[PDB]
Design an enzyme around this catalytic site. Structure first.
Site, PDB file in Angstrom:
ATOM      1  CG  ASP A   1      -2.194   1.045   1.099  1.00  0.00           C
ATOM      2  OD1 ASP A   1      -2.168   1.921   0.206  1.00  0.00           O
ATOM      3  OD2 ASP A   1      -3.047   1.041   2.011  1.00  0.00           O
TER       4      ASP A   1
ATOM      5  NE  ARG B   1      -4.063   6.503  -0.643  1.00  0.00           N
ATOM      6  CZ  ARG B   1      -3.907   5.181  -0.677  1.00  0.00           C
ATOM      7  NH1 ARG B   1      -3.785   4.488   0.453  1.00  0.00           N
ATOM      8  NH2 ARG B   1      -3.843   4.545  -1.843  1.00  0.00           N
ATOM      9  CG  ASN B   2      -0.753   4.666   3.142  1.00  0.00           C
ATOM     10  OD1 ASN B   2      -1.585   5.200   3.894  1.00  0.00           O
ATOM     11  ND2 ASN B   2      -1.019   3.551   2.496  1.00  0.00           N
TER      12      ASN B   2
ATOM     13  CG  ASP C   1      -1.947   2.123   6.030  1.00  0.00           C
ATOM     14  OD1 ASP C   1      -2.163   0.895   5.830  1.00  0.00           O
ATOM     15  OD2 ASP C   1      -2.857   2.958   6.236  1.00  0.00           O
TER      16      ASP C   1
HETATM   17  C1  LIG Z   1      -3.514  11.748   4.327  1.00  0.00           C
HETATM   18  C2  LIG Z   1      -4.015  11.606   5.775  1.00  0.00           C
HETATM   19  C3  LIG Z   1      -2.977  12.083   6.765  1.00  0.00           C
HETATM   20  O1  LIG Z   1      -2.296  13.069   6.484  1.00  0.00           O
HETATM   21  N1  LIG Z   1      -2.731  11.323   7.863  1.00  0.00           N
HETATM   22  C4  LIG Z   1      -2.868   9.856   7.894  1.00  0.00           C
HETATM   23  C5  LIG Z   1      -3.792   9.265   8.972  1.00  0.00           C
HETATM   24  C6  LIG Z   1      -4.391  10.102  10.109  1.00  0.00           C
HETATM   25  C7  LIG Z   1      -3.404  10.879  10.967  1.00  0.00           C
HETATM   26  C8  LIG Z   1      -2.854  12.172  10.330  1.00  0.00           C
HETATM   27  N2  LIG Z   1      -1.912  12.931  11.173  1.00  0.00           N
HETATM   28  C9  LIG Z   1      -0.774  12.433  11.927  1.00  0.00           C
HETATM   29  N3  LIG Z   1      -0.401  11.034  11.977  1.00  0.00           N
HETATM   30  C10 LIG Z   1       0.645  10.547  12.736  1.00  0.00           C
HETATM   31  O2  LIG Z   1       1.310  11.270  13.484  1.00  0.00           O
HETATM   32  C11 LIG Z   1       0.911   9.074  12.650  1.00  0.00           C
HETATM   33  C12 LIG Z   1       2.126   8.592  13.123  1.00  0.00           C
HETATM   34  C13 LIG Z   1       2.420   7.256  12.953  1.00  0.00           C
HETATM   35  N4  LIG Z   1       1.596   6.380  12.354  1.00  0.00           N
HETATM   36  C14 LIG Z   1       0.406   6.845  11.913  1.00  0.00           C
HETATM   37  C15 LIG Z   1      -0.491   5.848  11.246  1.00  0.00           C
HETATM   38  C16 LIG Z   1       0.028   8.177  12.052  1.00  0.00           C
HETATM   39  N5  LIG Z   1      -0.051  13.385  12.474  1.00  0.00           N
HETATM   40  C17 LIG Z   1      -0.675  14.567  12.086  1.00  0.00           C
HETATM   41  C18 LIG Z   1      -0.242  15.862  12.367  1.00  0.00           C
HETATM   42  C19 LIG Z   1      -0.979  16.940  11.907  1.00  0.00           C
HETATM   43  C20 LIG Z   1      -2.139  16.739  11.180  1.00  0.00           C
HETATM   44  C21 LIG Z   1      -2.589  15.458  10.858  1.00  0.00           C
HETATM   45  C22 LIG Z   1      -3.826  15.291  10.015  1.00  0.00           C
HETATM   46  C23 LIG Z   1      -1.840  14.364  11.311  1.00  0.00           C
HETATM   47  C24 LIG Z   1      -2.088  11.993   8.995  1.00  0.00           C
HETATM   48  C25 LIG Z   1      -4.547  12.307   3.367  1.00  0.00           C
HETATM   49  N6  LIG Z   1      -5.886  11.780   3.564  1.00  0.00           N
HETATM   50  C26 LIG Z   1      -6.282  10.973   2.411  1.00  0.00           C
HETATM   51  C27 LIG Z   1      -6.826  12.883   3.760  1.00  0.00           C
END
Ligand SMILES: */C(=C\C(=O)N1CCCC[C@@H](n2c(NC(=O)c3ccnc(C)c3)nc3cccc(C)c32)C1)CN(C)C
Length: 290
Positions: free
Chosen positions: A136, A140-141, A154
């Site tokens: 995958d 986005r991942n 992911d």
């Molecule tokens: C991509 C979506 C997107 O940008 N995110 C992926 C999943 C949701 C969380 C989001 N996010 C994180 N994630 C993590 O810190 C993290 C660390 C380790 N493993 C995982 C699975 C996730 N940190 C963030 C900081 C600021 C804002 C956000 C949103 C955020 C990231 C596009 N989509 C298709 C919309």
């Protein structure tokens, strides 16, 4: 055949404070949180990802995450065995690189673009060494720790091979022909996805095969049609993507070689990418808590 001596750390509910909600979707709910490892006197900024079928899957994602260690792969800091299963992982403050490239189009330079490509290629080559097919790989991942540092995430689909993997719902657009046609997944099938991932960045988050239903993608690629040349791309760059989208998977570039090209290119990025105007107290990042 090598014994997986990875350690799985079980965390106390009390050891960490759940701050805001970074995002909730199909995959689950991600929370911005802080982790204080007991006597440790450190505060670690974390991201906390939250039925037996549901619990089974999350734990296998934990098995894979715990078994990896690379500057370009998301690290599992530990798991919390409460009423619900939670994965505690290093907080990536800038989220997914897709949203990042979309939200910062007008200020994203060729130096950054080319380095992101190296960083991904590197991680992917680490997963290759570790006999693990991602399955995958998308923009986005790929998460942004700093704009100067990205890490692959992911591992819900990640499959650990041994001495072509045979397989739910799937991407289709990042998938290689053989994966679409026969559910054959290999590191070279990940090369196809890497190619697609590069295309996503060079188009600043453009949707691959926009307006084409997934049931059509199969025949489209069989016909020899591919994703077009992103405007910022010199033929040198577009060629690399085109080599990822070959029918013969052995003809696809190896991740170790993509690392080379993209690095060569990042030594002079303006020759390869044509962008308009290219020219609280005791907090420790997980990358420093070993
Ligand atoms: C991509 C979506 C997107 O940008 N995110 C992926 C999943 C949701 C969380 C989001 N996010 C994180 N994630 C993590 O810190 C993290 C660390 C380790 N493993 C995982 C699975 C996730 N940190 C963030 C900081 C600021 C804002 C956000 C949103 C955020 C990231 C596009 N989509 C298709 C919309």
């Amino acid at each position: 055949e090598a014994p997986n001596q990875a350690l799985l750390r079980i965390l106390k509910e009390t050891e960490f404070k759940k701050i805001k909600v970074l995002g909730s979707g199909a995959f689950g709910t991600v929370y911005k949180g802080l982790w204080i490892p007991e006597g440790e006197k450190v505060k670690i900024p974390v991201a906390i990802k939250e039925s037996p079928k549901a619990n089974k899957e999350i734990l296998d994602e934990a098995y894979v995450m715990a078994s990896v260690d690379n500057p370009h792969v998301c690290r599992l800091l530990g798991i919390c065995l409460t009423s619900t299963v939670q994965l505690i992982m290093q907080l990536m403050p800038f989220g997914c690189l897709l949203d990042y490239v979309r939200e910062h189009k007008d200020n994203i330079g060729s130096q950054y673009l080319l380095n992101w490509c190296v960083q991904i290629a590197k991680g992917m080559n680490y997963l290759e060494d570790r006999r693990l097919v991602h399955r995958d790989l998308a923009a986005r991942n790929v998460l942004v720790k700093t704009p100067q540092h990205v890490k692959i995430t992911d591992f819900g689909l990640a499959k650990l091979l041994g001495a072509e993997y045979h397989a739910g719902k799937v991407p289709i657009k990042w998938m290689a022909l053989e994966s679409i046609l026969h559910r054959i997944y290999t590191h070279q099938s990940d090369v196809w996805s890497y190619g697609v991932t590069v295309w996503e960045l060079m188009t600043f988050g453009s949707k691959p095969y926009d307006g084409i239903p997934a049931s059509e993608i199969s025949s489209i690629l069989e016909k020899g049609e591919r994703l077009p040349q992103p405007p910022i791309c010199t033929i040198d760059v577009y060629m690399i993507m085109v080599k990822c989208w070959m029918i013969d998977a052995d003809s696809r570039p190896k991740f170790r070689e993509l690392i080379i090209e993209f690095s060569k290119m990042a030594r002079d990025p303006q020759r390869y990418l044509v962008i308009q105007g290219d020219e609280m107290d005791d907090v420790v990042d997980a990358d420093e808590y070993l």
